């Protein structure tokens, strides 16, 4: 279909990271409809929960 | 980020209006406060690691519970985040006390911040009071001149966490 | 401004700053007082520096006040003035910051295609600066136009 | 004081030679507000980094920038299209064999030579059966990228210790420069004319 | 990359040494310099534009064919690589100028660039030509004094090509 | 150092040096006897700047030179002191390029890694650049040992 | 050409050309005589048209060919006119091509950077190719007109 | 890539004419040429697989060995590999076919491949080999005339390779 | 459509259409009307069709309608019969469209793991589709025959 | 990668062939010694850190000038690279007497460390000899009959680079 857009929060588990990585564990962004499943797998593996999950588009 | 010089730029600048009086009382009074601020800059860089050992001590002091099982400091992983995101406040409060602004406060420390501890499960009266704890550390030892000052950016990451 | 770029430097690395930022920092604020003193001498001439490079630049070029030309009219030559009282601001304004980084988000950045919307040549533009430049430069002692000639040509290099 | 007596004499090595070094300013987008100059210059880096060069405004691409900076797409959303727009399959996929299109992406996108056979072995399945598309956002979607660069920073040339051969090659590809002609079209011959 | 005072540190970290009188003398020779090497480095870059027109425009007269069908700046394309190319030398020439070294010319611009003009097509008797013709037109507007020392790293980059 | 920051903060940019960078330059060449002289005096004192700093550092930390500490014995003592050497050298070093570059490209990088390997502690290390701190600003004019303190502050940050 | 877009579209994504594709280029090639009757005709014409459109860009632009302009001399409106001859052999190139990559990659790529070094008025470029649009355009029949439009009016595009 | 439409584009802009009646004869020749190449295109594409699995039969009837333990496309992956490289030199040859010029094999194909082949242990001589059973197959499927400029191109890619 | 993909490919660059793309969509919506009556007779004879390209399917692989086979018995055959139906309405589709993405979109994107949890072997289909080729070629006028031959080409050659 | 049994797989794979009296006898061999190199990696791997103490002090004794400035091994950063070296070379030992094969060594060590070093500068002798000197600190602490089995591979390393 088309695009989704995506609230996911992915903490770390593997290390203490030095720089401020805010923006890598906390975040909203859109994926295409063809992307969503690997992006939806991706942020499963690394242990982060998807907070939420709309159809922008389509 | 925001700087107080950049801020009286943009006060004037969406006026369409030259520097008067005012503007230049403002500028006057942040460069003289300027080598005030570089010298709290220098000693708070000097002291990081000291100041967090000692504000994160006084935290777990108070709360011992936070790092007995249970707590959300309980485990090394855990309680390293957390001298981390002390870090982080010191270094970024420093960050603001240079520039005489909390533009980068709320750029880059507040931005999302809460709602990821809530997520997390992270307590945010516990980090508040670590900030404190930073708070009173840091005034010890930049002396009582940039205490205030430094004091100004604790209390805004205090608010804006609370 | 310098206390801005050294700032963000220093993020970037997810460090404080180091010793030599803290100087670079120190001799800026050392430098206010001149600094302030130089902007208040050119925002206290602004209508002088004003017309004086707008007779220059006109001098330079009929043809953008000629018939068929950009700054035909009065109206248009008006526009033209005040285009000329911005960038004099802006100038100011970097001026105090110490740095071009003013100018560059006020007056450049976008710069190109907005006088290409306005079919407003861009050289110009670079010889209204270059007088302006002139005209500024002479209302200050050696070492303060030496100094605003730099924001000057930035200004007059970056719509080039 | 005699033991920290120099023993190599002034054929002895400074701090400059050895291992080469990433460059030392990371460019990134923060979530949250960011000066105008800064973020030109965050994606003049970007374009620097996936094109080898500045490309200029008539080349650059305005949909990617204006998302961007609205906050809607990251920095390795923005790294995708990029990637997948016809400026990069016109630059650095057509004047290539497909092997060749692979070391360029892993110089591109993880700034680094391919580490492996196993590398070229998957990525020329994906481009002899996918092509472009797929095979970048199997870069770009790879646990590498996220572990050296996220969703916030602008790739940049890296010079990785592991694995064996890695390195060496990795100074290899990042100091290239593009060494194609631009264009197919009116080529440039080698002579004189004699006034 | 490496500036003249980090030459002077590099040899005498080699040599486990403090500076010495010689290396004092170094040292303050670069620093009288510096405000030369400044007011040089602020005029090419306020002439960056100017001094590329002026140069391309002479080497476009002295290889005509260089411009003319099958030339290798025949082309809208060619012809913009070829000045942004002139850019390139001339922004670098600077940079080892503030620097006082031409460490920044080796890894920065000669580093395998013979190899990428013959793969290209790119003439390099032609490049250094244009080298030539920017070194002239800078020489007049930096002023004797700063054009014997931009002469000296728009000649490294010559000989490195050539 | 100075020059070589603002110089690679430009190419990273693609661009010529501002008129801040070039201020910040100037700034630095016009600074550079007075920081020459002190590099001047640090060198002069080097022995008795090692003397007493070691004599402060083995008497605020006992446990360092008794046995089953790192630097028992005239050898490790002497390797200790050496080790002081290296770091008041790269002091002067950075004293003279304007900030702390030479000290961290010589002796912060890996430091860590490197004192774990020879079983050093780093509490003794930040109290060994402590003490050289307080022994060598003892020698300076104010100014002068304010400046020579934030690079011993840097080092002492980089070791703890 | 039509057929390399088409061939570099399927090859970017590892596939044969699809039936669209094919239908395209068998368009294409099924158009070929009568492109290269207009783009034979605009040949003819080279001279024709390059004098015509010269005279009415020198006559709405005196000051070009006047002293002081850009084209002033034999030598300098021989260039200009040499220019206009390089887009119209593009334009045939374009034609023939059936598309306008020929006139993107040899003229349009770099031009604003090509006359910005050579400090050529691009509104001068933009109404030449207007005046040679014009002119061809006389010549040709109405279909012919409107496709050598279509290109002429790319290229005006392109220079604006 | 150049087309034949590119290559005479490219013959008579490097030397600033225009177009010539030898020119245009060959642009008509390419015209006529079209159709048959677009026939051509469409019938090896709707028989890819059907070509490639033909010339892998009899490739592998000639040389049994090559299939056998201890050859080279004896495993999944390597026979797997084998048929896929027969893909990319029919896709490629249909391409080249396509644009009546052989400029994409070049660049997209032979570019490297021998030293490709050579540090993977391929032998060349049955790639040739299998070339030339792929032209064999395909020139049953595309008829006569499509056949001859077909095999234009399965030669131009054996003789590159060999 | 030949439109979405031309609008898309200039979409992808931020560009209007060039000539080229607008020569694509004028022979495009010039031949509509053939397209259309192709499309029609397509429609008109559907049921033929199937018939007629099922018989020859089954006689070339009875393997298929034999017991053990995957169209055994009349519900499996109407089946496979209802699967050609639909097949000829995507190739419907995609003469009017004048390519091949609905086919793509509706019946080729994932029919590989259709026809694998379907155990239908895709030999088979391909087969199938070779038949209703014939079938449907036989019953229209050349040029139309073989514009629907490059649909159903297509078609077999996304099959396998 | 390769082990002995991947070894002796591979070897009658690309014969064709099932195993046979002496493949058994080799799998025989190999099980039989896999204790005594699970408890050798075991030995290894508690005393790696104290392992590279050791011969790291061993090898800039010996030479000191690796350390002293303007040596290799001379900063913070080279020293830590020297080391971090020898941690790998003892890592992939230990994988290599684990695997029963020197195999690792070759394709994950040895191919393209001396192309590696030279462009870098290592000094490649002073390599061996720390190699060397691991396997002198090595063969002590894992006991004779596992030592002669690790200083297969040690030996393999030093003869690589040599
Ligand atoms: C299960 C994961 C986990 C661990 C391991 C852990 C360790 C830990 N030990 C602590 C205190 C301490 N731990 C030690 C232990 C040291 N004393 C000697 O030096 C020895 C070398 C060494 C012990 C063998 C000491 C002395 C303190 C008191 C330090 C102080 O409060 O000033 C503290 C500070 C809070 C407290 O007093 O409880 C932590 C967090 N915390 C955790 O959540
Ligand atoms: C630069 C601005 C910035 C901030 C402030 C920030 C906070 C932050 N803290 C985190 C985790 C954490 N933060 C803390 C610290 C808290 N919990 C303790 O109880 C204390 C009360 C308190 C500190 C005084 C802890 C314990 C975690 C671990 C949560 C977990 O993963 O289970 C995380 C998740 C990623 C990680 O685990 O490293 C973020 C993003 N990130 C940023 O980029
Ligand atoms: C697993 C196989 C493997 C090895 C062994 C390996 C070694 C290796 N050593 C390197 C640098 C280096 N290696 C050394 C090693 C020391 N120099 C001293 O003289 C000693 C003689 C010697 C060790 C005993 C040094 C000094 C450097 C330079 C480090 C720097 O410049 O920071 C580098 C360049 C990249 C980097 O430093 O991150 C590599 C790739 N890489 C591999 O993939
Ligand atoms: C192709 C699809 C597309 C659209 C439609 C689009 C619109 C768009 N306009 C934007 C900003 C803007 N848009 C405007 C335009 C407004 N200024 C007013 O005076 C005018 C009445 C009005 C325009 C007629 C302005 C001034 C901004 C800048 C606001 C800022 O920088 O804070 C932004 C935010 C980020 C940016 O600066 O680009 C978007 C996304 N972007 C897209 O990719
Ligand atoms: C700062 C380090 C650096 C250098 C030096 C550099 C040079 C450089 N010039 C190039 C193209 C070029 N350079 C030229 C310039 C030549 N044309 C005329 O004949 C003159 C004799 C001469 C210039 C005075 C031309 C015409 C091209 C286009 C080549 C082509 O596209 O076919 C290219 C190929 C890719 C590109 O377009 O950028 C490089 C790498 N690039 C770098 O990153
Ligand atoms: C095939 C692509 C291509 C183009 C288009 C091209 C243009 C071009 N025009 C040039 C000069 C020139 N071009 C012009 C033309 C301008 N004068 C008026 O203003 C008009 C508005 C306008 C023409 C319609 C003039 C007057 C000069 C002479 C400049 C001088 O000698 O000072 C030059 C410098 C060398 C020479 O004198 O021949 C080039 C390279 N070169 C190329 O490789
Ligand atoms: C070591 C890994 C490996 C395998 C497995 C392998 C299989 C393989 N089987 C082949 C032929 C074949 N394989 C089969 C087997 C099929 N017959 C029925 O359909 C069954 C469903 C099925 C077996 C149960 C048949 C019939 C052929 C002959 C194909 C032909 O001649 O057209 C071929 C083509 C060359 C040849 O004739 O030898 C290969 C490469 N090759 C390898 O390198
Ligand atoms: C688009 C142009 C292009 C081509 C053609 C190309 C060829 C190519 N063939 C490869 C491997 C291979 N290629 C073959 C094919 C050979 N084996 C038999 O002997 C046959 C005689 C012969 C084929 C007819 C085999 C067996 C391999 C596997 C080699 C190995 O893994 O050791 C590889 C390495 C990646 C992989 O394993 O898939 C490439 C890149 N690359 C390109 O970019
Ligand atoms: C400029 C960059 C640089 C530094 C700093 C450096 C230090 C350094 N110190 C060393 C030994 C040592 N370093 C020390 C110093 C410690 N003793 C006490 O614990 C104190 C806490 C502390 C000093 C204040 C001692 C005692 C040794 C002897 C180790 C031994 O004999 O086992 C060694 C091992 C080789 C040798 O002794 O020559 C190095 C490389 N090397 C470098 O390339």
Redesign the pocket.
Known sequence: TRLFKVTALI???KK??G?????N??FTKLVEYDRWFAEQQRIQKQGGKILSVKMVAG | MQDAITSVINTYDVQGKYFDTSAFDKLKAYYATGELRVRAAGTISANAATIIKEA?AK?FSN?PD?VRPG???Y?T???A??????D??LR?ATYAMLAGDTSILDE??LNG?KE??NS????IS??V???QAMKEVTGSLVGSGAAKEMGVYFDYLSSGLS | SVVTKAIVSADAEARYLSPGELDRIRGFVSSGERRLRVAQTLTESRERIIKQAGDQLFQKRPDLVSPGGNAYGAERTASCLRDLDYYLRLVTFGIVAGDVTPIEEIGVIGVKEMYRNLEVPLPGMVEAVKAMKSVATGLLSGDDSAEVGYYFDYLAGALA | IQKGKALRGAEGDPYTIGTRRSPKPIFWVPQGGTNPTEFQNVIRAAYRQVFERDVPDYQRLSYPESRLKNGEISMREFIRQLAESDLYRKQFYEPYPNTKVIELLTKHFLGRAPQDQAEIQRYNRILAGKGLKVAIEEVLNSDEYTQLFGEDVVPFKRYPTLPTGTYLASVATNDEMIQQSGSSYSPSYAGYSYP
Do not use: K
């Open positions: 903490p770390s588990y203490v990271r720089g401020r990585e805010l923006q564990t906390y | 994160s935290l709360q936070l707590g959300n400091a485990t992983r855990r309680y985040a957390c001298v981390r995101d002390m982080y406040f970024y880059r420390v911040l990821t501890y997390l499960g992270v307590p516990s980090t009071q670590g900030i």
